[PDB]
């Protein structure tokens, strides 16, 4: 029901440094720290961020704190993008987040590739934007969350996060 708890369902929430798929040190809600194998480099960058010898463990609060900036960096990139902005503006609240989710996960540029589906959405072509979506590298990597996003675009209700 809220931007934070929506990405919790997807990215998941970890209050201790862990490694992503490719073995990256990250914490909280998909926040990356370092790409280097250092365990002492992640904590470091963690303290720098939190601003406190956390010893690689944070509080819920600190996560949201990192979350919001992660989220602003997502929005800021959209705002400064010729292909998403328009689309973004055109969307309702419920669909603005489905939009921010992809940029949270893929990135400003990456999401700036789906011009096929980009346009249909701006045009309110839900049922059909959903289709080009399904046929995508994205859908096949994290189909779990991807098909959740697509539904919130398809409908405009955040119901997909109401069963899971």
UniProtKB/Swiss-Prot annotation:
Q: Where in the cell does this protein reside?
A: Host cytoplasm
Q: Name one Pfam family in it.
A: Phage_lysozyme
What are the inducing conditions?
Expressed late in the viral replication.
Annotated active site residues, numbered on this chain, are: 11 (proton donor/acceptor), 20 (proton donor/acceptor)
Q: What is this protein called?
A: Endolysin
**Binding annotation for substrate:** 32, 104, 117, 132
Q: Which organism is it from?
A: Enterobacteria phage T4
Consequence of mutating residue 117 to I?
500-fold decrease in enzymatic activity
User: One of this protein's GO BP terms?
Assistant: defense response to bacterium
Task: Write down the top EC class of this protein.
Answer: hydrolase
Q: What is the effect of changing residue 20 to E/Q?
A: Loss of 99% of enzymatic activity
Outcome after substituting residue 11 to N: Loss of 84% of enzymatic activity
InterPro entries, per the entry: Endolysin_T4_type, Glyco_hydro_24, Lysozyme-like_dom_sf, Lysozyme_dom_sf, Phage_lysozyme-like, T4-type_lysozyme
Functional summary from the UniProt entry: Endolysin with lysozyme activity that degrades host peptidoglycans and participates with the holin and spanin proteins in the sequential events which lead to the programmed host cell lysis releasing the mature viral particles. Once the holin has permeabilized the host cell membrane, the endolysin can reach the periplasm and break down the peptidoglycan layer.
pH-dependence annotation: Optimum pH is 7.3.
Q: What is the effect of changing residue 11 to Q?
A: Complete loss of activity
What's a Gene Ontology MF term here? Answer: lysozyme activity
Q: Does the keyword Hydrolase apply?
A: yes
The principal localisation class reads: host cell
SUPFAM superfamilies on file: Lysozyme-like
**Enzyme Commission number(s):** 3.2.1.17
